[PDB]
A paper describes a structure:
To better understand how each of the ram mutations impact ribosome conformation, we solved structures of programmed ribosomes containing P-site tRNAfMet and lacking A-site tRNA. The 70S-G299A complex lacking A-tRNA was solved to 3.5 Å resolution. However, similar to the 70S-G347U empty A-site structure, the 30S shoulder domain of the G299A ribosome adopts the closed-state position. This movement of the shoulder domain positions G530 close to A1492 of h44, and in this case, G530 adopts an anti conformation, poised to monitor the codon–anticodon helix. Mutation G299A promotes inward shoulder rotation and syn-to-anti isomerization of G530, while G347U promotes inward shoulder rotation and disruption of B8. In the absence of A-site tRNA, the mutant ribosomes exhibit a partially closed (on) conformation, with the 30S shoulder rotated inward.
Decoding is thought to be governed by a conformational transition in the ribosome—open (off) to closed (on)—that occurs upon codon–anticodon pairing in the A site.
Numbering used by the authors:
A (entry chain RD): 2 to 273
B (entry chain R7): 1 to 47
Amino acid sequence: AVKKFKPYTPSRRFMTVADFSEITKTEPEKSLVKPLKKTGGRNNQGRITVRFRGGGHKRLYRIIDFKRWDKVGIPAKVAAIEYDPNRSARIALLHYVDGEKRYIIAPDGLQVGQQVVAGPDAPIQVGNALPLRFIPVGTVVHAVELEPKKGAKLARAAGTSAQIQGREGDYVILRLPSGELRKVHGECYATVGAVGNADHKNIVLGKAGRSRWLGRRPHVRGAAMNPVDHPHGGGEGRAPRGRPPASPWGWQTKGLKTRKRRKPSSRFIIAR
Amino acid sequence: MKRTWQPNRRKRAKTHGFRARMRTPGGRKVLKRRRQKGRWRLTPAVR
RNA sequence: CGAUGUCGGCUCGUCGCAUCCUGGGGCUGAAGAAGGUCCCAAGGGUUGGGCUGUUCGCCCAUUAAAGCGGCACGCGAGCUG
RNA sequence: GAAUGCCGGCAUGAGUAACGAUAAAGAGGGUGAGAAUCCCUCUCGCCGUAAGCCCAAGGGUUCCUACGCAAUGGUCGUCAGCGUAGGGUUAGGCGGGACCUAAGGUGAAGCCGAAAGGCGUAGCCGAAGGGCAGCCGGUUAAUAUUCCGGCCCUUCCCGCAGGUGCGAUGGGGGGACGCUCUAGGCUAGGGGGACCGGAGCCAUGGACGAGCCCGGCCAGAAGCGCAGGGUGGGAGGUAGGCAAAUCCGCCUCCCAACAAGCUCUGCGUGGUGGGGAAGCCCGUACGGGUGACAACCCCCCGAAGCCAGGGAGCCAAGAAAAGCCUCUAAGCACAACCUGCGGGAACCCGUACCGCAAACCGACACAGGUGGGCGGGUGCAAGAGCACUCAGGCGCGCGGGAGAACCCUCGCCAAGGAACUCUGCAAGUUGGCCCCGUAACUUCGGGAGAAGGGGUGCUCCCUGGGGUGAUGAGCCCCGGGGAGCCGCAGUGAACAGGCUCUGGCGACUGUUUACCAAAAACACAGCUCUCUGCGAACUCGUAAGAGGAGGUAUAGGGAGCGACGCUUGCCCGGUGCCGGAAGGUCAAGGGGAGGGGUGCAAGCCCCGAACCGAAGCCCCGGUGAACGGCGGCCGUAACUAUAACGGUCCUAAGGUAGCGAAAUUCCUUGUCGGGUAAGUUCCGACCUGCACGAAAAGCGUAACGACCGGAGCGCUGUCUCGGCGAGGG
RNA sequence: GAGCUAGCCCUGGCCAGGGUGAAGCUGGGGUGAGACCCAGUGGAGGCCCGAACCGGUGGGGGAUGCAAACCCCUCGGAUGA
RNA sequence: UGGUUCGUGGAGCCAUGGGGGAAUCUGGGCGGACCACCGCCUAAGGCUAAGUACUCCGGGUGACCGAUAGCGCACCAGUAC
RNA sequence: CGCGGGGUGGAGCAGCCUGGUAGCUCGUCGGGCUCAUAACCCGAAGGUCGUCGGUUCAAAUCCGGCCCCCGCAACCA
RNA sequence: AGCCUACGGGCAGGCGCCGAGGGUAGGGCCCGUGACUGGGGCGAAGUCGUAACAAGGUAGCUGUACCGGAAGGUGCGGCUGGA
RNA sequence: CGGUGAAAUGCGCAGAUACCGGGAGGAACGCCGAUGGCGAAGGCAGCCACCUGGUCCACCCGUGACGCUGAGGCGCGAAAGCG
Ligand SMILES: [Mg+2]
Ligand SMILES: [Mg+2]
Ligand SMILES: [Mg+2]
Ligand SMILES: [Mg+2]
Ligand SMILES: [Mg+2]
Ligand SMILES: [Mg+2]
Ligand SMILES: [Mg+2]
Ligand SMILES: [Mg+2]
Ligand SMILES: [Mg+2]
Ligand SMILES: [Mg+2]
Ligand SMILES: [Mg+2]
Ligand SMILES: [Mg+2]
Ligand SMILES: [Mg+2]
Ligand SMILES: [Mg+2]
Ligand SMILES: [Mg+2]
Ligand SMILES: [Mg+2]
Ligand SMILES: [Mg+2]
Ligand SMILES: [Mg+2]
Ligand SMILES: [Mg+2]
Ligand SMILES: [Mg+2]
Ligand SMILES: [Mg+2]
Ligand SMILES: [Mg+2]
Ligand SMILES: [Mg+2]
Ligand SMILES: [Mg+2]
Ligand SMILES: [Mg+2]
Ligand SMILES: [Mg+2]
Ligand SMILES: [Mg+2]
Ligand SMILES: [Mg+2]
Ligand SMILES: [Mg+2]
Ligand SMILES: [Mg+2]
Ligand SMILES: [Mg+2]
Ligand SMILES: [Mg+2]
Ligand SMILES: [Mg+2]
Ligand SMILES: [Mg+2]
Ligand SMILES: [Mg+2]
Ligand SMILES: [Mg+2]
Ligand SMILES: [Mg+2]
Ligand SMILES: [Mg+2]
Ligand SMILES: [Mg+2]
Ligand SMILES: [Mg+2]
Ligand SMILES: [Mg+2]
Ligand SMILES: [Mg+2]
Ligand SMILES: [Mg+2]
Ligand SMILES: [Mg+2]
Ligand SMILES: [Mg+2]
Ligand SMILES: [Mg+2]
Ligand SMILES: [Mg+2]
Ligand SMILES: [Mg+2]
Ligand SMILES: [Mg+2]
Ligand SMILES: [Mg+2]
Ligand SMILES: [Mg+2]
Ligand SMILES: [Mg+2]
Ligand SMILES: [Mg+2]
Ligand SMILES: [Mg+2]
Ligand SMILES: [Mg+2]
Ligand SMILES: [Mg+2]
Ligand SMILES: [Mg+2]
Ligand SMILES: [Mg+2]
Ligand SMILES: [Mg+2]
Ligand SMILES: [Mg+2]
Ligand SMILES: [Mg+2]
Ligand SMILES: [Mg+2]
Ligand SMILES: [Mg+2]
Ligand SMILES: [Mg+2]
Ligand SMILES: [Mg+2]
Ligand SMILES: [Mg+2]
Ligand SMILES: [Mg+2]
Ligand SMILES: [Mg+2]
Ligand SMILES: [Mg+2]
Ligand SMILES: [Mg+2]
Ligand SMILES: [Mg+2]
Ligand SMILES: [Mg+2]
Ligand SMILES: [Mg+2]
Ligand SMILES: [Mg+2]
Ligand SMILES: [Mg+2]
Ligand SMILES: [Mg+2]
Ligand SMILES: [Mg+2]
Ligand SMILES: [Mg+2]
Ligand SMILES: [Mg+2]
Ligand SMILES: [Mg+2]
Ligand SMILES: [Mg+2]
Ligand SMILES: [Mg+2]
Ligand SMILES: [Mg+2]
Ligand SMILES: [Mg+2]
Ligand SMILES: [Mg+2]
Ligand SMILES: [Mg+2]
Ligand SMILES: [Mg+2]
Ligand SMILES: [Mg+2]
Ligand SMILES: [Mg+2]
Ligand SMILES: [Mg+2]
Ligand SMILES: [Mg+2]
Ligand SMILES: [Mg+2]
Ligand SMILES: [Mg+2]
Ligand SMILES: [Mg+2]
Ligand SMILES: [Mg+2]
Ligand SMILES: [Mg+2]
Ligand SMILES: [Mg+2]
Ligand SMILES: [Mg+2]
Ligand SMILES: [Mg+2]
Ligand SMILES: [Mg+2]
Ligand SMILES: [Mg+2]
Ligand SMILES: [Mg+2]
Ligand SMILES: [Mg+2]
Ligand SMILES: [Mg+2]
Ligand SMILES: [Mg+2]
Ligand SMILES: [Mg+2]
Ligand SMILES: [Mg+2]
Ligand SMILES: [Mg+2]
Ligand SMILES: [Mg+2]
Ligand SMILES: [Mg+2]
Ligand SMILES: [Mg+2]
Ligand SMILES: [Mg+2]
Ligand SMILES: [Mg+2]
Ligand SMILES: [Mg+2]
Ligand SMILES: [Mg+2]
Ligand SMILES: [Mg+2]
Ligand SMILES: [Mg+2]
Ligand SMILES: [Mg+2]
Ligand SMILES: [Mg+2]
Ligand SMILES: [Mg+2]
Ligand SMILES: [Mg+2]
Ligand SMILES: [Mg+2]
Ligand SMILES: [Mg+2]
Ligand SMILES: [Mg+2]
Ligand SMILES: [Mg+2]
Ligand SMILES: [Mg+2]
Ligand SMILES: [Mg+2]
Ligand SMILES: [Mg+2]
Ligand SMILES: [Mg+2]
Ligand SMILES: [Mg+2]
Ligand SMILES: [Mg+2]
Ligand SMILES: [Mg+2]
Ligand SMILES: [Mg+2]
Ligand SMILES: [Mg+2]
Ligand SMILES: [Mg+2]
Ligand SMILES: [Mg+2]
Ligand SMILES: [Mg+2]
Ligand SMILES: [Mg+2]
Ligand SMILES: [Mg+2]
Ligand SMILES: [Mg+2]
Ligand SMILES: [Mg+2]
Ligand SMILES: [Mg+2]
Ligand SMILES: [Mg+2]
Ligand SMILES: [Mg+2]
Ligand SMILES: [Mg+2]
Ligand SMILES: [Mg+2]
Ligand SMILES: [Mg+2]
Ligand SMILES: [Mg+2]
Ligand SMILES: [Mg+2]
Ligand SMILES: [Mg+2]
Ligand SMILES: [Mg+2]
Ligand SMILES: [Mg+2]
Ligand SMILES: [Mg+2]
Ligand SMILES: [Mg+2]
Ligand SMILES: [Mg+2]
Ligand SMILES: [Mg+2]
Ligand SMILES: [Mg+2]
Ligand SMILES: [Mg+2]
Ligand SMILES: [Mg+2]
Ligand SMILES: [Mg+2]
Ligand SMILES: [Mg+2]
Ligand SMILES: [Mg+2]
Ligand SMILES: [Mg+2]
Ligand SMILES: [Mg+2]
Ligand SMILES: [Mg+2]
Ligand SMILES: [Mg+2]
Ligand SMILES: [Mg+2]
Ligand SMILES: [Mg+2]
Ligand SMILES: [Mg+2]
Ligand SMILES: [Mg+2]
Ligand SMILES: [Mg+2]
Ligand SMILES: [Mg+2]
Ligand SMILES: [Mg+2]
Ligand SMILES: [Mg+2]
Ligand SMILES: [Mg+2]
Ligand SMILES: [Mg+2]
Ligand SMILES: [Mg+2]
Ligand SMILES: [Mg+2]
Ligand SMILES: [Mg+2]
Ligand SMILES: [Mg+2]
Ligand SMILES: [Mg+2]
Ligand SMILES: [Mg+2]
Ligand SMILES: [Mg+2]
Ligand SMILES: [Mg+2]
Ligand SMILES: [Mg+2]
Ligand SMILES: [Mg+2]
Ligand SMILES: [Mg+2]
Ligand SMILES: [Mg+2]
Ligand SMILES: [Mg+2]
Ligand SMILES: [Mg+2]
Ligand SMILES: [Mg+2]
Ligand SMILES: [Mg+2]
Ligand SMILES: [Mg+2]
Ligand SMILES: [Mg+2]
Ligand SMILES: [Mg+2]
Ligand SMILES: [Mg+2]
Ligand SMILES: [Mg+2]
Ligand SMILES: [Mg+2]
Ligand SMILES: [Mg+2]
Ligand SMILES: [Mg+2]
Ligand SMILES: [Mg+2]
Ligand SMILES: [Mg+2]
Ligand SMILES: [Mg+2]
Ligand SMILES: [Mg+2]
Ligand SMILES: [Mg+2]
Ligand SMILES: [Mg+2]
Ligand SMILES: [Mg+2]
Ligand SMILES: [Mg+2]
Ligand SMILES: [Mg+2]
Ligand SMILES: [Mg+2]
Ligand SMILES: [Mg+2]
Ligand SMILES: [Mg+2]
Ligand SMILES: [Mg+2]
Ligand SMILES: [Mg+2]
Ligand SMILES: [Mg+2]
Ligand SMILES: [Mg+2]
Ligand SMILES: [Mg+2]
Ligand SMILES: [Mg+2]
Ligand SMILES: [Mg+2]
Ligand SMILES: [Mg+2]
Ligand SMILES: [Mg+2]
């Protein structure tokens, strides 16, 4: 349940902050993990590439175990649920009985002291990683690989979930959070359970401040630019965009599909 | 009000310096053009 | 067109008369008072506000009257804008 | 002889404008060929969270002294930041380097590019960040944490003395961190004192008095003392920390739970060293002496600074590396490393001076700009605000008279109060604190400082709380009640809201046309559409590579709308986009019916129709919070008027809700109603909407606005309608 | 050529003094348990007044200027985009 | 595709980026599509003086200048600024 | 004052470009159905094609002139 | 600073609180009134349609929601005052 | 092929309708079923488990008048509607 404010100043009657009750008494982070400073940058080697980024609070990166085949059959116990500012979801600190400490994406219902195992064994309960080959049909799964032994690259944001629908030979088909039925390999590891912190959907920023704090700089409409800047720009008061709506670079923005149709990955995709 | 020339030995040396001219092939001709006409100073005198 | 600043207001005026008043006068369908119209007459005077950027105009309260025009639609090396 | 010609010279305006903040000068005396302008003294004025001190950048001899005044100085000049010459900058501890890393730059391996060159892991470079050992005084005309004096430290290298498995750029810990609010004890700084030490002074009516005036400090090893920060100690087992570890990490019983103990700071006191006024006397620009054998004590206020890696709360979740401690690997365990002592060795660069400005950036000795620290006292509730004033520094490098117009900047005014005017533009009224008291509306926060009021000084009396002192006096912080005094007036000077009612737009804080526009424009939280399943879409680049992102549909891009409430209607005919293994057309290519050129012929060379031939287009469907569009003419009801009703025509469908003479209305100052004595503006209505209308959104909406309009109260030189006075010209 | 200007990255600094008083904590109340209501504490916020600081709203001055954007009064923000 | 006078032209020759792809004297290219005849050369490796171009440099000469001319500089000029 | 569309039976539209034909729907008139009306069924009439000319053998039709009606335009100072 | 007939007294007079009332400012309730506007009742033979009463020719009524010149229609659920 | 009183719109030679096989998803639970049952009403239906309330019978065991109603308040409250 996201916690709300009273209108003692404007832009707090709408502002909403996430419930931080599941974050246990581990508010500062864990060294020997998180060894990296995050490189702040909006631009590649010079020019800006993705527009309207900059500012925002300073962040240290938490390194996350997406390769859960490192520790097959080696259990761990959850000792912390922590805040990762690099992500929409929360992270969980695993103490392996092996002795090594690792961060993981924190699923829904995962509580502290619960132990979690990875591998072909490690029964079907939240937090455990298995290959998609062994997980029963109809179960809910996150942290899914698309190709085996390349890293978890699916169903990682808050509240997201992928559902196993069936098998075709050595491939398993998944309903992805978009609704796309994608046919991904059987040996791809994937962590059972939904992601959780699904209330990230409901948080209202209240003001421009919380966007600037997250590094979202003000987005400028093409209607208010000039014909040298944007296709929509120019004219006297509030031109109605005078053409099929386009990007600053000319490509149309409403309906024009932009994936390569000749992709080799198109014969693994079934739905929207 | 604040004007254009806000001096800095660091900036002047690292921008208009001999070791900066010698990196780029464009700045190498700046030295060629100045030696061939007889400039007493190929570089802004930075101290 | 190698530059003649444009409306309106303000300040300062000055001139024409085909005269709004005051002065003189003929006719009147002028009894008297108040009028009408025409002639002589410019010496002087020709209000304060509401609306509008406005000139003009419509109003309000008066007045002897609340005149029309010219002067680069007088006047920005005088003002405003 | 002309080209607003080029170059140089000299004229006119003209002894005219000006001489650079209205902080302000007067006299006496020196020097001097020459003094308003240089030096000295007395008097006056100005700054004083600076116009005063200390740094950094930048400037580069401007610093000090001697001799000088051609030019520089907006005048003069004996003066100078000016000319000639000489002198002056002293570091193991300050800053930087023989240390480290951040962004970024660079770059062996590697990738890429016609060439030049573009990337790029490790590494290297890269600093107000991390690390690291000096405090107090005195000397020079000019340097000092640099020289000197006292006290105190840091690295090495070489020796002896005592310990231990020693030992890496490798493993681990630590370094190491946000914002806001803050608790305890200190310190910096400050106020008072009958106490202590001092030259001196009793003036002009009074005072020989706990009188006046001035001063009552600084640093300081170990040891203590007081605050405070960091840390648990054993045993096993151990697959992880890319070899190995006894170290770290993970389990499992035992022992404390705590600063008890180990360190580590800070602050006092500490052997001892040093400083030390006012006033008086002199040979200088400047300092010297005595005052002193100086005293060097006690209270109170007290930080934003210290203990510091303190605590609490919150979300927007808060550098890296080296030094440092520990662990082992080669090797080595005669080596080596640790602790204590002794001796010796400690290099390079900066160091003057200006430094909110006459020395920097503005062509100028330019009213502009320039980052960090100290920035005293008194009063006003507080405060870096305001007024005066310590220390300190200035009177701004043209002056002297006059007392016109006119101008700037001021001050005041009879009666009237906006009649001024585009507009109360400007100017004025209000103005601090305490206490009453406060409407519609409201999103229940607000609106609110609504509005509108009252008290404000001084003296005397009684009396309630705290803080530091022991519960007490004292010093300080807040209060309550009573009785009186004076003036026109008590925030007695300076700093310090005019208020209300009602509309438009925009929700709001915010951004914008450096240098005529700050807005109703932009942005904004939030809504919707659409693309993108990850070597994502999109963006830069030929490429490599990179952003997106060390992200993964609750994510990322693009587009529009722009809090919030109630809503967003019909048209897919044309355009865009989306979906259609049919069909038509369709280029290269395949294919060869058939024909041509040469050969004596094998042959060689040309064309060349059926037919097979993609995307695209045509065709078929869909789609509006995609581009867009959303009718005309007639007649009809109990008087007149109008038309709920009907007829016909066309369209892809013919504007629904909600608004409406509006930021939209031409005719138009439309017509009614309200405000006025009078209202082309304003407000409320009607609807004949030239030419509103639903995300280029529609209608509303509390709060908000240096936005735009209308009105009213208070007040006023805006005006009737001017007058007087002041200072700079 | 980014020593002016715009944006972003790395690393430091600055924001006197007052007001208002959100969440949360303690106690009392309420209930069958709650919701919730009271005080006391607490000190939130692109909150309020207002210096430094950052701007540049209205007017006046300036116009071969002190100044190729200045000066005076007035004014906005001033813990945050 | 480029070069050549050749801009697709009857478009050869000479180089080529792309696809297919031989032969060794009875072998191969060329003589401006092409075919026959008649002739000329012998590709898919390389080197090679001299004659030719220029004038930082020294000399000779000038119906060249003579300090606003002649080089931007006759002068300590690529200086001051 | 300009540019281009239109005036056709009582109403609303066709027919014009390509001349010899004026058609559609409603309405009017007469008769059916009903008890009567509306609805419906059957059968009829009705147009100087805005006026003035000239073109042709012949004009709603083609060409000019006026009178009406509709739409756009009327800018830069 | 006055006047008194028996004076550490009396009167006149002065000051102070309260004070009817007048003024200023903001609220509460009520009454009249206003261009225009909503709906109501009645009125004469007006216009449009036929919703309900007979299975009223679509059984009716209802709460709600949306739409339509208007009765009204339709969606969801309910009722017997219907079969 | 759909559909109807009859038709039309519509769907389909791009391969519809009818048939088979597999897959996805959502809603409601046929037969039992009733003139039934349960609940204070609204209302409640495939099956399983857990947590849970009301209620009936016998035995006449204990308390022993603790009882009835109920303005307020409080909770529940079909369908439609709202975030
Ligand atoms: Mg680290
Ligand atoms: Mg880079
Ligand atoms: Mg670069
Ligand atoms: Mg935008
Ligand atoms: Mg624009
Ligand atoms: Mg551009
Ligand atoms: Mg364009
Ligand atoms: Mg363009
Ligand atoms: Mg002209
Ligand atoms: Mg001329
Ligand atoms: Mg006359
Ligand atoms: Mg007369
Ligand atoms: Mg007369
Ligand atoms: Mg008479
Ligand atoms: Mg007469
Ligand atoms: Mg006016
Ligand atoms: Mg005129
Ligand atoms: Mg005149
Ligand atoms: Mg004229
Ligand atoms: Mg004129
Ligand atoms: Mg002028
Ligand atoms: Mg004028
Ligand atoms: Mg104007
Ligand atoms: Mg103006
Ligand atoms: Mg001539
Ligand atoms: Mg000449
Ligand atoms: Mg000229
Ligand atoms: Mg000249
Ligand atoms: Mg002269
Ligand atoms: Mg003179
Ligand atoms: Mg003159
Ligand atoms: Mg003069
Ligand atoms: Mg003068
Ligand atoms: Mg001066
Ligand atoms: Mg003398
Ligand atoms: Mg420095
Ligand atoms: Mg320096
Ligand atoms: Mg200089
Ligand atoms: Mg010099
Ligand atoms: Mg000097
Ligand atoms: Mg001298
Ligand atoms: Mg001189
Ligand atoms: Mg000389
Ligand atoms: Mg001079
Ligand atoms: Mg000067
Ligand atoms: Mg002399
Ligand atoms: Mg000198
Ligand atoms: Mg060395
Ligand atoms: Mg060395
Ligand atoms: Mg180094
Ligand atoms: Mg290193
Ligand atoms: Mg190369
Ligand atoms: Mg490089
Ligand atoms: Mg380095
Ligand atoms: Mg370095
Ligand atoms: Mg450093
Ligand atoms: Mg440092
Ligand atoms: Mg140091
Ligand atoms: Mg000095
Ligand atoms: Mg010293
Ligand atoms: Mg060891
Ligand atoms: Mg070591
Ligand atoms: Mg480490
Ligand atoms: Mg390390
Ligand atoms: Mg001290
Ligand atoms: Mg002290
Ligand atoms: Mg004494
Ligand atoms: Mg005396
Ligand atoms: Mg003292
Ligand atoms: Mg001490
Ligand atoms: Mg232990
Ligand atoms: Mg190991
Ligand atoms: Mg403790
Ligand atoms: Mg000590
Ligand atoms: Mg002394
Ligand atoms: Mg002295
Ligand atoms: Mg802390
Ligand atoms: Mg390193
Ligand atoms: Mg240590
Ligand atoms: Mg020095
Ligand atoms: Mg110095
Ligand atoms: Mg300073
Ligand atoms: Mg200067
Ligand atoms: Mg200078
Ligand atoms: Mg200048
Ligand atoms: Mg000066
Ligand atoms: Mg200033
Ligand atoms: Mg400054
Ligand atoms: Mg201070
Ligand atoms: Mg002070
Ligand atoms: Mg006082
Ligand atoms: Mg104050
Ligand atoms: Mg301070
Ligand atoms: Mg003063
Ligand atoms: Mg002084
Ligand atoms: Mg001066
Ligand atoms: Mg006076
Ligand atoms: Mg007056
Ligand atoms: Mg008066
Ligand atoms: Mg008045
Ligand atoms: Mg007026
Ligand atoms: Mg007037
Ligand atoms: Mg106004
Ligand atoms: Mg004003
Ligand atoms: Mg006042
Ligand atoms: Mg009110
Ligand atoms: Mg209001
Ligand atoms: Mg309030
Ligand atoms: Mg008040
Ligand atoms: Mg108000
Ligand atoms: Mg007094
Ligand atoms: Mg105490
Ligand atoms: Mg104290
Ligand atoms: Mg008083
Ligand atoms: Mg004031
Ligand atoms: Mg308003
Ligand atoms: Mg308006
Ligand atoms: Mg501007
Ligand atoms: Mg400009
Ligand atoms: Mg503004
Ligand atoms: Mg919205
Ligand atoms: Mg790039
Ligand atoms: Mg590209
Ligand atoms: Mg990439
Ligand atoms: Mg990245
Ligand atoms: Mg987006
Ligand atoms: Mg999106
Ligand atoms: Mg918009
Ligand atoms: Mg907008
Ligand atoms: Mg509302
Ligand atoms: Mg719409
Ligand atoms: Mg359409
Ligand atoms: Mg379409
Ligand atoms: Mg279509
Ligand atoms: Mg279509
Ligand atoms: Mg298509
Ligand atoms: Mg072909
Ligand atoms: Mg062929
Ligand atoms: Mg095709
Ligand atoms: Mg009628
Ligand atoms: Mg009709
Ligand atoms: Mg409609
Ligand atoms: Mg309009
Ligand atoms: Mg008025
Ligand atoms: Mg009126
Ligand atoms: Mg009116
Ligand atoms: Mg109105
Ligand atoms: Mg209207
Ligand atoms: Mg609009
Ligand atoms: Mg729209
Ligand atoms: Mg809008
Ligand atoms: Mg509106
Ligand atoms: Mg709105
Ligand atoms: Mg509003
Ligand atoms: Mg505003
Ligand atoms: Mg604002
Ligand atoms: Mg207003
Ligand atoms: Mg005046
Ligand atoms: Mg005067
Ligand atoms: Mg004067
Ligand atoms: Mg810059
Ligand atoms: Mg910059
Ligand atoms: Mg505060
Ligand atoms: Mg509270
Ligand atoms: Mg606060
Ligand atoms: Mg604020
Ligand atoms: Mg504000
Ligand atoms: Mg303020
Ligand atoms: Mg400061
Ligand atoms: Mg600034
Ligand atoms: Mg201004
Ligand atoms: Mg402006
Ligand atoms: Mg101005
Ligand atoms: Mg304000
Ligand atoms: Mg403020
Ligand atoms: Mg060619
Ligand atoms: Mg060719
Ligand atoms: Mg050609
Ligand atoms: Mg050719
Ligand atoms: Mg080839
Ligand atoms: Mg060949
Ligand atoms: Mg050939
Ligand atoms: Mg040949
Ligand atoms: Mg030939
Ligand atoms: Mg040949
Ligand atoms: Mg050869
Ligand atoms: Mg060769
Ligand atoms: Mg040659
Ligand atoms: Mg020569
Ligand atoms: Mg020359
Ligand atoms: Mg000569
Ligand atoms: Mg027609
Ligand atoms: Mg027609
Ligand atoms: Mg009939
Ligand atoms: Mg009938
Ligand atoms: Mg023009
Ligand atoms: Mg134009
Ligand atoms: Mg007595
Ligand atoms: Mg009395
Ligand atoms: Mg009273
Ligand atoms: Mg009263
Ligand atoms: Mg009273
Ligand atoms: Mg009275
Ligand atoms: Mg009253
Ligand atoms: Mg009341
Ligand atoms: Mg009323
Ligand atoms: Mg019915
Ligand atoms: Mg019926
Ligand atoms: Mg019925
Ligand atoms: Mg219903
Ligand atoms: Mg319907
Ligand atoms: Mg029903
Ligand atoms: Mg019935
Ligand atoms: Mg029945
Ligand atoms: Mg099937
Ligand atoms: Mg579905
Ligand atoms: Mg039960
Ligand atoms: Mg019994
Ligand atoms: Mg429901
Ligand atoms: Mg719903
Ligand atoms: Mg709705």
